[PDB]
Structures are given as C-alpha cells and as structure tokens.
C-alpha cells in the first residue's frame, strides 16, 4: 500500500476514538422516540457537523505488515499472504496444516 | 470398467410383502432420495391392481412383469462407415431391470391424475398386452429379429 494510504488509517482511527462518546450520545437522542422534537432536530444538524473521518464505519482493516486492503483475517491482523508466510516458519503459535 | 467391480450391494426386502424384487422397483421409481414417498405410491398402485385382477399383489404385479421383460436386445457396433445393430441374449437380472424401467417410463408418460393411478393402469394394461411399456418390448424384439444375420460375430 502507498505510505499515504497506510497513514489515512491512523488519522481515521485517532479521530474515531476521540469523538467516540460525543457521537454516541449525540446519536442517542436521535433514536429516542420519547424526546423533544426541538432537541432531536438540533442533534441531526450537530452530528453531521463533527468530522466524517471520526466515524468507525469509515476505516478499513489493512494488514499491519504490508498494508493490503483485501484478504484480511481478524485473528491475526494479517493478509492471507503474510499469514501463510508466518505460519510456515512457526511464528503463529498452535497454527498448522489441517486434515479431516 | 477395465477391471472387475467387487462388492455387490444389499437391497433390503419390502416392509410389507418382503420381496427384494419389489424393493428394487421402489428405488427405480424413487426420485431425489424420497424413498417413503415412493414406498406409498407403489403400494397404492398394487392395492388397485389387486382390487381388479383379484390375484394377490406379489403375484399380480409379476404378471405385468412377464408381459414386458425382453429376451433379446441389440448392441450397436461401428463397421466401416456403417453401424451394425447386433442381437444378443439378455441377462436375467438385466431383463428385470429393463421391465421395471419401461413400466415406470410408460407410467409417467400419461395424463392420469395421481402417479398411483398411472402406475396402476400401466401395470394392469401390461397384464393384457396393451400399453407403451409392452409396445417398447415388441419393438426391441422386432429389431433383433430383423438383423439376426449378425448373431454370431464376436466383433
């Protein structure tokens, strides 16, 4: 991945978990049926204001070795490629080829 | 295949009439693994065969079976530009398989309401030399009779 692309993921994480609470509670009123029309309407304008890159849906799991955007695995935080490379050295405890 | 297939299977006999023969007949009618559905359809046909011939079931369904088994089939063989149809004996077990297949094939190709009706009617007609099933055997036999000259080739 382009250094830039790796970087955006850091800008995006950092924000996401700084405005995390602000978003949550500012959302919480939106979905409150039993609340002031005055309040909720304000909120809708207020959420859309604080920055896009601060949303958790905005980020993309990239291999934390090569930066790849595709073929990611959560258990290892690596791409299918780097998982295999490390598997075979025995740098992933337990993991090994399987048959049944 | 080029070698010999070892290990023939075991058909369990019918729950009712306790025949391996009829058990095969079910499998042949069976579709998409639905053995119970087929088990029903078969018995309800024999009921209605029994209820008209009045000649038992495992002894009536037989009489259909005899009117339709072939005794001589034709194999094809490419000779020059041409293809020789050649007559051959039929194995006992094979002529069972064919009779049971032709009966089923003839049944389905009818306009009656149930499957059970179609089978029943067909089995009845079989017993009186009538339906498509029995027509087919006649035709097979006609063809082997025609090109009898090629009876003894081994080629």
């Amino acid at each position: 991945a382009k250094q830039s692309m790796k970087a955006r993921e850091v800008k995006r994480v950092a924000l996401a978990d700084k405005y995390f609470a602000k978003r949550a509670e500012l959302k919480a009123i939106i979905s409150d049926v039993n609340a002031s029309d005055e309040d909720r309407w304000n909120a809708v304008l207020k959420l859309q204001t604080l920055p896009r890159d601060s949303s958790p849906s905005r980020q993309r799991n990239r291999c934390r070795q090569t930066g790849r955007p595709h073929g990611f695995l959560r258990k290892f935080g690596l791409s299918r490629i780097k998982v295999r490379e490390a598997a075979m050295r025995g740098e992933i405890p337990g993991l090994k080829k399987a048959s049944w | 295949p080029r070698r010999r297939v070892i290990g023939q299977r075991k058909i369990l006999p019918d729950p009712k009439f306790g025949s391996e023969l009829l058990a095969k007949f079910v499998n042949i009618l069976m579709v998409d693994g639905k053995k119970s559905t087929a088990e029903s359809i078969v018995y309800s046909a024999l009921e209605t065969l029994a209820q008209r011939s009045g000649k038992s079931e495992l002894e009536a369904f037989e009489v259909a079976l005899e009117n339709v088994r072939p005794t001589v089939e034709v194999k094809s063989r490419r000779v020059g530009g041409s293809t020789y149809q050649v007559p051959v004996e039929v194995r006992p077990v094979r002529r069972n398989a064919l009779a049971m297949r032709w009966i089923v094939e003839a049944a389905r190709k009818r306009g009656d309401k149930s499957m059970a009706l179609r089978l029943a009617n067909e089995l009845s007609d079989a017993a009186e030399n009538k339906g498509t099933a029995v027509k087919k055997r006649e035709d097979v036999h006609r063809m082997a009779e025609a090109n009898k000259a090629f009876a003894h080739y081994r080629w």
Binding site: - | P1, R2, R4, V5, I6, R154
Partner: protein
C-alpha cells in the same frame, strides 16, 4: 475397478482378436505356457470364423 479380471479369459480373447484380424501365431506375447495355451486356443478358433466372413 476393485480387482483385476481373469487373466486366462483375457489371454483367450486377445488370441481370438489377433486371430480374426489375421496376425501370425508367434506374435503371442506369452511364454507362461498356461496363458500361451489360452492365446493360441483363441487364435485357432478365430481362424475358423474368418473363412465365413467378408
């Protein structure tokens, strides 16, 4: 598929087929006198049948 066919029978039909197609005895690939007898046995039966074929 699970087990090899009868070697004697096969040897007898290989004999027949070289026979009808008109190869010479002494093409026979067997020296095992047992299989050899089957091969020639076929080859000579076939020699009869060729006559009445065209």
């Amino acid at each position: 598929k699970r087990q090899k066919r009868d070697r004697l029978e096969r040897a007898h039909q290989r004999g027949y087929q070289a026979g009808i197609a008109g190869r010479s005895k002494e093409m026979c690939p067997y020296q095992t006198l047992n299989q050899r007898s089957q091969w020639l046995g076929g080859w000579r039966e076939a020699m009869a049948d060729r006559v009445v074929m065209a």
